[PDB]
Design a protein around this ligand. Structure first.
Ligand SMILES: CCOC(=O)c1cc2cc(-c3cc(C(=O)NCc4ccc(C(=O)O)cc4)nn3C)ccc2[nH]1
Ligand SMILES: CCOC(=O)c1cc2cc(-c3cc(C(=O)NCc4ccc(C(=O)O)cc4)nn3C)ccc2[nH]1
Ligand SMILES: [Ca+2]
Ligand SMILES: [Ca+2]
Ligand SMILES: [Ca+2]
Ligand SMILES: [Ca+2]
Ligand SMILES: [Ca+2]
Ligand SMILES: [Ca+2]
Ligand SMILES: [Zn+2]
Ligand SMILES: [Zn+2]
Ligand SMILES: [Zn+2]
Ligand SMILES: [Zn+2]
Lengths: 169, 166
């Protein structure tokens, strides 16, 4: 027999993602690079592996949309809500949606896609918001201007509580 | 940090359920009997008790729907998906939906509602699918043609690991 897990998490280490469509604001290559980096933030500290699919059904379906876009959480035009993602689960579970009424960027001019994606994929993997003001899962966007991203310890502790550390070296 | 905590089991032993609507395939009486029997499967071997409400909110809301039916886990017409249920908890937790594009029956002509409900209620109570091919929670529908239902030992051990014996 089998009982459900105590927390909302993926029961496999190999996860797939698919970029279903693209924002006007950035090149396909910029978007792919931002999401690739965002996944590596989490894979670096767990045993999770992320592989991109070009079509079909992926564990984490990523899309850009506006207003009503196929769930219970319509976006709201420019400003306000920027993106959301669903916790691990069947169907839409894991999916990440970005509001294409916002301005997305590879830099600091608008919302940096890498940073927002890194946060949202935390949700896709089973992290909720943190109360630690220095955490990536702290629900307020910031951009620090420095050149090297480091996943804050609170997020490391949270994600490893779910999946373990993978290779610690 | 925060994770999304799952409710492994219901915190109370007395649960309510409501049959929100009814399939065209069976009489109201047959549907009521099927669900009552499906709950009895699990109450017979645990301290769980189930009481039916006729209106308002209940712990387990039971309904029949087709295609997109209000939770964005759409059914797919005849065949394929037959039903699904949400794990224990508040809100949608515990609820069970049956695909009304399937033919439901009190006998063998189609899918036996009692059997599929008994399986789905196992999910509503916190059981996942079993790997034991003989278990009720094994993810393949069967119908043995026998008149008496017996909960397989794997499901008995599973449900009791959560709620204990009766
Ligand atoms: C609407 C959902 O958004 C959020 O809720 C949310 C986003 C976010 C981002 C940081 C954050 C920002 C930085 C940072 O600026 N790091 C410097 C850096 C390094 C490299 C790059 C690059 O390669 O592009 C960009 C920035 N770090 N954190 C932990 C912290 C908390 C956060 N919450
Ligand atoms: C959503 C898809 O559903 C499933 O995944 C699923 C259904 C199912 C049913 C049995 C099963 C069937 C019988 C059986 O036929 N029992 C005899 C019987 C006796 C009485 C009645 C009656 O009162 O109507 C019906 C049947 N037993 N088991 C353990 C075993 C595994 C199963 N998996
Ligand atoms: Ca917005
Ligand atoms: Ca998904
Ligand atoms: Ca845009
Ligand atoms: Ca409920
Ligand atoms: Ca179906
Ligand atoms: Ca029907
Ligand atoms: Zn959405
Ligand atoms: Zn968030
Ligand atoms: Zn449903
Ligand atoms: Zn099932």
């Amino acid at each position: 027999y089998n009982v459900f897990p105590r927390t909302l998490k993926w029961s496999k280490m190999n996860l797939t993602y698919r970029i279903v469509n693209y924002t006007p604001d950035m090149t396909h290559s910029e978007v792919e690079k931002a999401f690739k980096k965002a996944f590596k933030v989490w894979s670096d500290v767990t045993p999770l592996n992320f592989t991109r699919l070009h079509d079909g059904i992926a564990d984490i379906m990523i899309s850009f949309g506006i207003k009503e876009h196929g769930d219970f959480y319509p976006f709201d035009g420019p400003s306000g809500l920027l993106a959301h993602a669903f916790p691990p689960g069947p169907n839409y579970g894991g999916d990440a949606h970005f509001d294409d009424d916002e301005t997305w960027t590879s830099s600091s001019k608008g919302y940096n896609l890498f940073l927002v994606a890194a946060h949202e994929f935390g949700h896709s993997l089973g992290l909720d918001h943190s109360k630690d003001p220095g955490a990536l899962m702290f629900p307020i966007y910031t951009y620090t201007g420095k050149s090297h991203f480091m996943l804050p310890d609170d997020d490391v502790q949270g994600i490893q509580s779910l999946y373990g550390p993978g290779d610690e070296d």
